[PDB]
């Protein structure tokens, strides 16, 4: 009677251990350099919804993340949003 | 000597008279090649060799150039000629003759690419000749690999791996001759050779890269990738029905478990090929391995497509065994065995019963399985914390601030002790293992490694953490153990 | 002292017996530091090219001079110990390629024998060594990875059986690879079943039959490792019934000083519970399995038999 | 062999209309005699059932059915 | 006209006559295991993975 | 008391004020409590069965329908009245999970 599903606790990213069971755009801010708003452009431009927790967020999405937050002016965002 | 005469005066070349001349004498050189299957030419066959190479710049020299019926009709049979003599001497090759076999292959080659643009049926008389050639070392390799042969393997490596073209002509005609009964039968003599040819692991229906063209005009081979897994799979279906041996039985459950399910189309005439391969349970020490990479098909169909085996977990608790650790495919299945129990349906009666003959397993099992072995348990342990009563019972435990009367009752309680798990006992749930301690992981706390005694002492420390990193401490062997305590 | 060759050219120049007195002249003279390293090297490598080639000679004649050779290598080895280890370790490179170019064609009575010139050596009670460790799991994996099927390869896993037997008297550790040796030696020597498909055996043609005396004058351990493992192609009853009980002894030896201590002694010694208890209702008289199940059976009603305490900590303030 | 036997008796025990239809999509007389070998009887019964109602309702795939 | 549905760590309910997420709770840790209604149709009780 | 279901039940539902059915295993008994005895027991599915549900008295040629779902996407519908008899089926291609009714 088995059942099969698609979780991740405390978890490393960018060299930051950020937590999976808080708010993903929060966890970017804990992500150290990177503060609210920047957070909520990345995880807007990254196209995932806002209210999952990061324990949700499988790998594919998560270095999609990765990708846009440091290749960040090739993915649209202004000089002026940037450092 | 007079191969090389006669290639020079081919070479300064009545020019099609002395080609056909030539041709004849290249046409010779298969009677030449029945001589060198005794010697060949005193076992180097430069002469022979050195002929091939003159052959093919005939060929080549023909095909740029050349009573229109009779030219032509003598410049095509002095094509075809050195082309069969290439296949026959492809053929006839019992003796292990590399660079006559490189020739022939070369020339078979370059013929082929010549017909393609300017002349199917040759490269159907080339597989035949291929797979009519034999050798004692191609036979039935059994200690690994599936035929070690010559000339079929380096057709393989540097041109079967190379046309996509070629790979759906290849397979359609394989269809063809299939169909055609007695090359059939050259097929079914020839299991094993397909199994070379296929294990290269870069097919057409691989998507993930890109294969170059041989003919620069390719004849609509990318019609229909379902018509390649139709091709795939009827020379599967009559490979896997057509005489079967063990060694290569292994070689195919393991390109059916990793490469063939891209490529297939009927995965029900699979379910059926492997619940047989997974129900196939005899008193043959060799065969009663296969249930693991069995097993594996028939799960990751399972996942796939929604089927079932009644008293699944029952059988893997009847697959459990020594030889798992003793074969080298442990680590694959203890990575089945993860996604297996990774269900959150099982019971304590379940995992407590592969627990404890995981835990008989450890007592008696070498250092490279119990480190694989030691991150499963304390995963297990983990994910289901309603068996650390085996660890430690909470009334078997002593406390110096309680009455004589609960000491003597812990004493008679002691004494009136039976351990009650059975191991011959095949049904997990009603083995009762949840009463069982584990004395075995205590003597894995008594063990004799320091890394190993030391995932012990994690075992006995309180478990803090939950992710151990099963794929990191997965696959060791003395070997590595070596080369890491080395370093 | 120069080279391994030239050295042992000049040592068999001179004569195999009394090579000992003139190496030991020779490093007297040197020692009245790269000099003596090396004549480490060559002695190292020349005793075990002798037990390689030769044991004709007797206790008193050849086993004299291989104790004196085995004393002046105490002597150096209390006075190196960087170059010994050092070519340990390149022993330990040097016999590990020769087993993965030949897993059985490619070993030596020398290789038992430096195993066990070390473990008489070394601080073999150390828990991690540059040498004995790396040699600990050498010993495991020739013992093994072995594909038993002939009784000279029962008596290599059976000498070493006797030195991780010295190993763990002197450490008291434990080893399932042991345990798997004496399940599959007894398995392939009652093979001639029913009870036993998880050992997984290798050969089904050595055996043994109801035709032993097994008296006291019959053949005892009498380790000649060195003629008995060239010899033993030559298969009686007799050297089959002294390696059974060879490998026996080393079995009670290795439960009277460590598996008494091992807290899973019933749970290890089940499966050679089965196998004596076969052994005896098929020959009903061996006093020597019967004392080992007396033993065993004392330690049942001895032993805590109890669930544990493992995960019992204390409090964190 | 290369029967189709457990599919069968899977869907005779689940009467699955989809997966019977794909289990009787096959045409090869070999593995029809192997399954109808290795069946159930009563299996093969209600096989038999079936294999009438889906002919009743499309005569036009009674072609390849006929035979089993 | 509506009905709740468990799912990862959220509980979701829907309308009929919409086919829609009218209502989310989200204010849970881990994953919850039950939903139900009361016969008053006014409480709902969510439980969940921390006991 | 109790009445005897061998492999696990993952489902009691209280049919009728007298009946009531035990979903689990592959099987599922249906029961009757006064009796204290399973009056049928239906065995026609393929996988685990993972839900049942029952709906009575409502706008229906059929009264009363029983409704259980059992990871295949297969849900199929009995009754009662028909002493469980297979009435209906939907087939949805992932492993369903949990099925309800209005």
Redesign the interface.
């Given at each position: 009677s088995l059942v099969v599903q698609e979780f991740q606790h405390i978890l490393r990213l960018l060299n930051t251990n950020v937590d999976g069971n808080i708010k993903i755009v929060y966890a970017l801010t804990t992500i150290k350099g990177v503060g609210r708003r920047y957070s909520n452009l990345v995880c807007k431009k990254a196209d995932v919804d806002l209210h999952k927790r990061a324990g949700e967020l499988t790998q594919e999405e998560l270095e999609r993340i990765v990708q846009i937050m440091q290749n960040p002016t090739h993915y649209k965002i202004p000089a002026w949003f940037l450092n | 000597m007079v191969l090389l005469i006669s290639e020079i005066k081919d070479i300064a070349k009545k020019q099609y008279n002395s080609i056909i001349k030539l041709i004849n004498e290249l046409v010779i050189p298969e009677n030449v090649t029945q001589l060198e299957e005794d010697e060949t030419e005193k076992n180097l066959r430069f002469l022979v060799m050195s002929l091939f190479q003159i052959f093919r710049k005939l060929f080549s020299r023909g095909d740029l150039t050349l009573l229109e019926k009779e030219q032509f009709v003598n410049w095509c049979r002095k094509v075809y000629e050195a082309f069969k003599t290439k296949l026959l001497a492809i053929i006839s090759d019992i003796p292990f003759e590399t660079s006559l076999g490189l020739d022939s292959l070369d020339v078979y080659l370059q013929l082929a690419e010549l017909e393609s643009t300017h002349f199917n049926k040759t490269f159907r008389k080339l597989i035949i000749a291929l797979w009519s050639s034999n050798m004692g070392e191609i036979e039935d390799v059994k200690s690994s690999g599936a035929s070690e042969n010559l000339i079929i393997v380096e057709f393989t490596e540097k041109y079967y791996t190379k046309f996509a073209d070629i790979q759906y002509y290849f397979q359609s005609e394989f269809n063809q001759l299939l169909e055609d009964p007695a090359y059939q039968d050259l097929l079914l003599k020839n299991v094993g050779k397909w199994l070379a040819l296929v294990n290269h692991d870069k097919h057409c229906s691989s998507v993930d890269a890109d294969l170059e063209i041989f003919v620069p005009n390719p004849p609509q081979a990318i019609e229909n990738e379902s018509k390649f897994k139709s091709n795939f799979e009827k020379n599967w279906l009559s490979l896997l029905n057509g005489q079967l041996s063990l060694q290569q039985y292994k070689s195919i459950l393991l390109i059916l478990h990793k490469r063939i399910i891209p490529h297939f189309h009927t995965p029900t005439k699979l379910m059926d090929f492997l619940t047989d391969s997974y129900n196939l349970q005899s008193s043959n020490k060799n065969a009663g391995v296969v249930p693991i990479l069995a097993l594996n098909g028939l799960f990751e169909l399972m996942k796939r497509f929604n089927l079932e085996y009644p008293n699944f977990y029952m059988k893997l608790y009847q697959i459990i065994n020594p030889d798992l650790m003793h074969v080298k495919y442990r680590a694959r299945f203890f990575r089945l065995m993860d996604v297996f129990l990774s269900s959150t349906h099982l019971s304590a009666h379940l995992v407590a019963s592969f627990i404890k003959k995981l835990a008989r397993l450890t007592l008696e099992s070498p250092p490279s399985a119990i480190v694989t072995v030691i991150p499963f348990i304390y995963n297990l342990i983990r994910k289901h914390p309603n068996c650390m009563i085996m660890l430690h019972n909470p009334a078997f435990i002593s406390n110096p601030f309680q009455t004589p009367d609960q000491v003597a009752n812990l004493k008679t309680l002691k004494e009136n002790y039976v351990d009650p798990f059975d191991v011959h006992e095949s049904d997990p749930e009603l083995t009762h293992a949840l009463d069982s301690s584990l004395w075995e992981l205590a003597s894995l706390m008594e063990h004799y490694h320091p890394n190993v005694a030391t995932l012990a002492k994690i075992f006995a420390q309180p478990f803090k953490k939950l992710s151990y990193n099963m794929e990191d401490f997965l696959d060791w062997n003395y070997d590595s153990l070596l080369n890491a305590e080395s370093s | 002292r120069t080279h391994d060759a030239l050295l042992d050219q000049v040592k068999k120049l001179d004569l195999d017996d009394h090579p000992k007195i003139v190496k030991n002249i020779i490093k007297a003279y040197q020692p009245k530091k790269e000099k003596l390293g090396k004549f480490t090297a060559v002695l190292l490598r020349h005793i075990i090219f002798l037990s390689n080639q030769n044991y004709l000679k007797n206790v008193q004649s050849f086993k004299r001079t291989q104790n004196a050779l085995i004393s002046i290598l105490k002597s150096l080895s209390e006075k190196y110990n960087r170059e010994l280890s050092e070519e340990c370790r390149d022993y330990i490179n040097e016999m590990q390629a020769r087993y993965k170019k030949n897993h059985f064609d490619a070993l030596s009575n020398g290789d038992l024998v430096f195993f066990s010139i070390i473990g008489i050596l070394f601080s073999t009670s150390d828990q991690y060594h540059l040498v004995i460790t790396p040699a600990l799991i050498l010993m495991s994996q020739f013992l093994e990875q072995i594909k038993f099927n002939s009784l000279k390869r029962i008596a290599f896993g059976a000498v070493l059986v006797r030195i991780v037997s010295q190993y763990q008297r002197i450490s008291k550790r434990y080893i399932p690879e042991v345990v798997y040796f004496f399940q599959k030696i007894l398995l392939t020597f009652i093979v001639e079943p029913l009870d036993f498909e998880n050992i997984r055996l290798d050969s089904y043609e050595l055996g043994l039959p109801l035709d032993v005396d097994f008296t006291k004058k019959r053949s005892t351990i009498i380790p000649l490792h060195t003629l008995s493992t060239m010899d033993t192609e030559a298969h009686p009853v007799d050297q089959c019934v002294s390696v059974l009980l060879n490998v026996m002894e080393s079995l009670d030896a290795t439960i009277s000083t460590v598996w008494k201590s091992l807290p899973a002694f019933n749970e290890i010694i089940l499966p050679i519970q089965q196998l004596l208890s076969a052994y005896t209702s098929k020959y009903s008289d061996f006093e020597k399995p019967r004392n080992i199940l007396n033993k065993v059976e004392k330690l049942t009603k001895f032993t805590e038999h109890i669930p544990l305490a493992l995960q019992n900590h204390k409090p964190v303030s | 062999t290369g029967t189709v036997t457990v599919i069968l008796s899977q869907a005779l025990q689940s009467n699955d209309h989809s997966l019977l239809e794909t289990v009787l999509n096959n045409r090869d007389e070999r593995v029809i005699r192997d399954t109808i070998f290795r069946l159930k009887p009563a299996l093969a019964v209600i096989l038999l059932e079936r294999l009438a109602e889906r002919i009743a309702r499309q005569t036009h795939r009674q072609g390849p059915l006929n035979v089993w | 006209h509506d009905?709740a549905?468990?799912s990862?760590?959220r509980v979701q309910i829907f309308s009929?006559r919409t086919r829609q997420v009218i209502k989310t709770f989200?204010r849970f840790?881990?994953?919850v295991y039950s939903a139900s209604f009361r016969s008053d149709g006014k409480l709902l009780c969510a439980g969940d993975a921390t006991g | 008391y109790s009445l005897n279901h061998d492999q696990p039940v993952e489902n009691v539902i209280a049919v009728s004020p007298t009946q009531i059915v035990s979903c689990g295993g592959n099987n599922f008994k249906v029961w009757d409590l006064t009796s204290n005895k399973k009056l049928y027991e239906r065995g026609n599915f393929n996988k685990a069965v993972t839900c049942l549900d029952y709906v009575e008295n409502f706008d229906s040629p059929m009264q009363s329908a029983l409704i259980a779902s059992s990871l295949d996407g297969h849900v199929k519908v009995f009754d009662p009245l028909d002493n469980f008899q297979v009435k209906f089926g939907w087939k949805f291609s992932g492993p369903v999970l949990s099925c309800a009714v209005s």
């Open positions: - | - | - | - | 009905f549905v468990t990862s760590t009929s989200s840790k881990d994953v | -």
